[PDB]
Design a protein around this ligand. Sequence first.
Ligand code: NAG
Lengths: 48, 48
Amino acid sequence: VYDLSGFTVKPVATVHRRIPDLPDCDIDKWLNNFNVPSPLNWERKIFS
Amino acid sequence: SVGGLYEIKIPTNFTIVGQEEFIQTNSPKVTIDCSLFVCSNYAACHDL
Ligand SMILES: *[C@@H]1O[C@H](CO)[C@@H](O)[C@H](O)[C@H]1NC(C)=O
């Protein structure tokens, strides 16, 4: 009597969830802003 | 010994007493799938 290697049931479908209708982050507009700071006064922006 | 005789307590009445004794002779037959335990469903782990 041989105990074979364990199987797992195959997933029959995919569930994908995301919050709809969120705005674009505009990260490029902030990175391309020509008023660039020095390392002494490095700027932060938070995207959520 | 008082002369040739010794003092002894001899029973004048009795009963029967029961005593239980469990002796283990077996144990749960544990079996491990080493591959399923170590790596679960993950192909990248099964390779390593
Ligand atoms: C023996 O002990 C039992 C329980 O105490 C009692 O019922 C019985 O009468 C006694 N017999 C004698 C001969 O003492």
